[PDB]
Amino acid sequence: QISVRGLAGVENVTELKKNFNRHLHFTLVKDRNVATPRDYYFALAHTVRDHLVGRWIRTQQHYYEKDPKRIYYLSLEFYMGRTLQNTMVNLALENACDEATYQLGLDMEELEEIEEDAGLGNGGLGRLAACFLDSMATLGLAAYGYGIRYEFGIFNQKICGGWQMEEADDWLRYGNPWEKARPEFTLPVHFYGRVEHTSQGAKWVDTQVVLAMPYDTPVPGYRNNVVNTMRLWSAKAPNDFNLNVGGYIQAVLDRNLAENISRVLYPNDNFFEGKELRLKQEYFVVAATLQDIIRRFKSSTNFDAFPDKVAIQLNDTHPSLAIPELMRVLVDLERLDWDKAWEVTVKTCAYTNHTVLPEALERWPVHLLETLLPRHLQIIYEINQRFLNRVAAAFPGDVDRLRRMSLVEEGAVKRINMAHLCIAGSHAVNGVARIHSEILKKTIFKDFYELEPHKFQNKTNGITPRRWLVLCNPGLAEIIAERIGEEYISDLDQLRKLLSYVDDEAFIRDVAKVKQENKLKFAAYLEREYKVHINPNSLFDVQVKRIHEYKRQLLNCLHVITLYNRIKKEPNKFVVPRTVMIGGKAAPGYHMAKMIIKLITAIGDVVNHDPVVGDRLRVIFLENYRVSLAEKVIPAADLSEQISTAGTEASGTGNMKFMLNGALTIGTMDGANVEMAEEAGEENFFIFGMRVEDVDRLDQRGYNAQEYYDRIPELRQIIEQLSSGFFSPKQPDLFKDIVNMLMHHDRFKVFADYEEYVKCQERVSALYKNPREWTRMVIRNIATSGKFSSDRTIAQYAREIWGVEPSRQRLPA
Numbered sequence: 001q002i003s004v005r006g007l008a009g010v011e012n013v014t015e016l017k018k019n020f021n022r023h024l025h026f027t028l029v030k031d032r033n034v035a036t037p038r039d040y041y042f043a044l045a046h047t048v049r050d051h052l053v054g055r056w057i058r059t060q061q062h063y064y065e066k067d068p069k070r071i072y073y074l075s076l077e078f079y080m081g082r083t084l085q086n087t088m089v090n091l092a093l094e095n096a097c098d099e100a101t102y103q104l105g106l107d108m109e110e111l112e113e114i115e116e117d118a119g120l121g122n123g124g125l126g127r128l129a130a131c132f133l134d135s136m137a138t139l140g141l142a143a144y145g146y147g148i149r150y151e152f153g154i155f156n157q158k159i160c161g162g163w164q165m166e167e168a169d170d171w172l173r174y175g176n177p178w179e180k181a182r183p184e185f186t187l188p189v190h191f192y193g194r195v196e197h198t199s200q201g202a203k204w205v206d207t208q209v210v211l212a213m214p215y216d217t218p219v220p221g222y223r224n225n226v227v228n229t230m231r232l233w234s235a236k237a238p239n240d241f242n243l244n245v246g247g248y249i250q251a252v253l254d255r256n257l258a259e260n261i262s263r264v265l266y267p268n269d270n271f272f273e274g275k276e277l278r279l280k281q282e283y284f285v286v287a288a289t290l291q292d293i294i295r296r297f298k299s300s301t302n303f304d305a306f307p308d309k310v311a312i313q314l315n316d317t318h319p320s321l322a323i324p325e326l327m328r329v330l331v332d333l334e335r336l337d338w339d340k341a342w343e344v345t346v347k348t349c350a351y352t353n354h355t356v357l358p359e360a361l362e363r364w365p366v367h368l369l370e371t372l373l374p375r376h377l378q379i380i381y382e383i384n385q386r387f388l389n390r391v392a393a394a395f396p397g398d399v400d401r402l403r404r405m406s407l408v409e410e411g412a413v414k415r416i417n418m419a420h421l422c423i424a425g426s427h428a429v430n431g432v433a434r435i436h437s438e439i440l441k442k443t444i445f446k447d448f449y450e451l452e453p454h455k456f457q458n459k460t461n462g463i464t465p466r467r468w469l470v471l472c473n474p475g476l477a478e479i480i481a482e483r484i485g486e487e488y489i490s491d492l493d494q495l496r497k498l499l500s501y502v503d504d505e506a507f508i509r510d511v512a513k514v515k516q517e518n519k520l521k522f523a524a525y526l527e528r529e530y531k532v533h534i535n536p537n538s539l540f541d542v543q544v545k546r547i548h549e550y551k552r553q554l555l556n557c558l559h560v561i562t563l564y565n566r567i568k569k570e571p572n573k574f575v576v577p578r579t580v581m582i583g584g585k586a587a588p589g590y591h592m593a594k595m596i597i598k599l600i601t602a603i604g605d606v607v608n609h610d611p612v613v614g615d616r617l618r619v620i621f622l623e624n625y626r627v628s629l630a631e632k633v634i635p636a637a638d639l640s641e642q643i644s645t646a647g648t649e650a651s652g653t654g655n656m657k658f659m660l661n662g663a664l665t666i667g668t669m670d671g672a673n674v675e676m677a678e679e680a681g682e683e684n685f686f687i688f689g690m691r692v693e694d695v696d697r698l699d700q701r702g703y704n705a706q707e708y709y710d711r712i713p714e715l716r717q718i719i720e721q722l723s724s725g726f727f728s729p730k731q732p733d734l735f736k737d738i739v740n741m742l743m744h745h746d747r748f749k750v751f752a753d754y755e756e757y758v759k760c761q762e763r764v765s766a767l768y769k770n771p772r773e774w775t776r777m778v779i780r781n782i783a784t785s786g787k788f789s790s791d792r793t794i795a796q797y798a799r800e801i802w803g804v805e806p807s808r809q810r811l812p813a
């Protein structure tokens with residue numbers, strides 16, 4: 001149908017059809033008379049997966065022959081989403097499969113909807129890892145993603161009576177056609193035990209063993225025949241585990257305890273919970289991964305070359321135990337001297353920070369590490385002692401610096417600061433957007449920057465244009481390709497060529513047509529699967545991201561209520577119709593976040609049923625926001641809400657997805673919004689509110705929310721409506737906690753940005769009244785979105801941290 005989706009050759013289509021029928025028969029053990037839609041999905045997945053095998057085997061043998069430096073990306077989260085369409089896109093198989101299935105009497109899009117998301121992440125950090133894997137393969141890097149194969153991913157969100165309910169994400173129930181179990185590469189991981197000091201070195205003894213079984217998933221590069229590996233570990237009890245009939249049976253049942261390690265993803269976004277099971281998960285991935293790395297390195301004794309052949313990237317502090325684990329193996333097992341082992345470790349490891357919120361930073365109680373990982377604790381103490389001796393030599397007499405920089409935090413319970421460990425043990429430390437990286441050097445890691453300035457870098461985040469343009473918005477990808485060709489898909493900077501089309505009447509019409517079609521398609525999705533009715537001609541105002549106070553969904557809520565109150569005051573006055581869509585999951589134990597969701601639905605309940613409002617304002621909570629839903633709503637959006645308090649959103653990546661897909665942005669100068677505005681021009685961005693400096697000034701003075709309440713009559717009305725039970729008639733005090741927080745303990749200064757936000761939103765509505773000028777500004781955004789390709793980001797990691805050169809060169813098919 002459309003060019004960017006590839007060729008549908010006679011030979012290919014015939015071969016796809018016959019292999020589809022072969023799998024339906026031999027693999028699924030079905031015929032066409034009994035086959036269900038799910039059977040058809042699986043037959044297709046197997047048909048496509050067959051095309052990966054040859055390339056996968058030859059990519060890995062190529063790495064064996066050439067022996068390039070290997071990149072190991074360690075993460076507790078990989079938010080992959082669906083794999084079928086992505087695989088077809090990267091293999092140029094989409095049109096061929098579409099044709100083949102069409103001739104078999106099947107709709108491929110319908111089959112694609114059957115696949116479960118691989119929801120092995122919470123949000124931004126997990127999705128970044130996924131985009132990164134795609135870019136690393138597309139850039140021909142010898143890269144491996146290493147993580148955990150959770151049996152249960154991020155929970156499925158159900159909304160019941162306006163409240164979030166959680167249910168287990170049983171994503172493996174029907175099987176996963178995209179993984180290959182590798183039970184022959186199973187490795188032991190050790191826990192507990194004790195440290196024994198012998199004549200020659202320390203020994204870690206009397207441990208309990210859990211097995212780590214790897215599952216490999218292919219990661220195809222974009223049309224370069226490269227297929228890299230994501231290896232995810234699953235926990236397995238050894239056969240003699242816990243080994244009378246009651247006794248025998250119980251011993252077998254108790255194997256569950258060991259296997260619980262990989263059972264479920266911790267559902268916290270930007271928060272630290274010091275649970276033993278989480279620590280076990282963190283060590284489990286680290287221990288199994290490092291053994292795999294060392295084994296592969298030896299199959300190339302001399303560890304001087306280790307950093308020349310290995311890079312380990314730590315996705316935040318979650319796999320920070322890689323540092324003392326590498327030291328443990330090098331010192332205790334390989335018998336290297338401390339100083340050499342340390343040199344190797346530092347040159348191998350690099351650390352990426354993803355948040356400055358203090359509650360999110362990992363600080364593990366010493367007593368936990370003492371029991372679970374006694375040898376690692378000893379190594380951490382030794383690292384700390386040697387590190388502090390260095391600090392003391394550089395800043396003599398600065399006793400407070402010593403305590404501030406210590407890996408060991410004193411207090412009620414002694415804790416290890418994992419971020420401090422990571423900085424000490426890495427040759428590179430980076431933030432994820434220019435403003436964030438500057439904040440790291442100026443505030444939370446200031447002491448470390450002063451000691452080792454060369455270590456600190458920036459690597460602004462990005463998104464893959466494959467999933468986030470070609471896959472989810474083929475219509476836009478096509479109208480761009482018609483003008484500037486196809487090369488932009490792996491060279492997004494080429495989108496700048498679209499600037500010469502900003503006055504092109506045909507292109508303006510095409511951009512606007514593509515958006516309208518996307519909005520119609522999404523409006524049809526909402527009716528079919530949720531029976532909700534929306535005006536497709538209205539401005540699609542969307543805020544999708546995890547529910548957190550710093551992201552300020554509440555500020556959005558305040559604007560929504562302002563609009564409703566204004567309509568009610570002057571009903572027969574024209575307003576630009578809006579569909580306000582808010583979606584995202586709340587962490588199960590985050591009360592305030594759960595209250596915010598209830599508020600959103602409560603506002604919708606009132607607004608959506610007021611006859612005076614009509615089709616002029618609609619408020620919808622998008623249930624179960626996840627990668628597959630993002631691929632649907634983002635292409636349909638007109639306005640992207642990126643309204644975090646300045647200095648709180650490290651980067652954001654949802655922002656980039658919207659920019660690439662033809663939405664305009666209303667946002668604070670926070671995270672990557674700053675660079676987005678810089679790329680597009682501030683005239684082409686709806687910027688409002690406090691900058692970081694303004695927040696700092698307010699903090700010095702003290703933030704008094706009452707001041708705003710007293711001086712803004714429209715804000716007073718909203719608070720009074722909330723408190724009185726206007727939005728909860730049967731439970732008048734339902735939102736008392738929200739009001740109290742806003743008035744008395746608001747860390748994120750919702751009121752301080754209220755006036756500027758509402759004013760800015762009026763300017764959005766004004767522009768939307770002029771479709772031609774709206775679209776022209778959209779073109780200016782898409783055209784300057786190139787910087788935010790994860791290909792750019794990965795190329796920078798490669799050259800500036802890993803010391804490897806990216807390549808767009810094809811491997812033979």
Ligand SMILES: O=C(Nc1ccccc1)C(=O)N[C@@H]1O[C@H](CO)[C@@H](O)[C@H](O)[C@H]1O
Nearest residue numbers: 049050052053177178179180181217218
């Ligand atoms: O090939 C497989 N997965 C794969 C292949 C290519 C790309 C992505 C995933 C796979 O899972 N094969 C399974 O191996 C089992 C033995 O190890 C067989 O019993 C299964 O029938 C087969 O599906």
Ligand SMILES: O=C(Nc1ccccc1)C(=O)N[C@@H]1O[C@H](CO)[C@@H](O)[C@H](O)[C@H]1O
Nearest residue numbers: 124125270354355432649650651652653
């Ligand atoms: O810190 C994060 N997650 C987390 C933190 C602790 C425990 C589990 C997950 C996180 O997701 N941070 C986000 O990283 C994104 C990718 O760099 C950024 O775009 C976001 O700004 C940041 O909040």
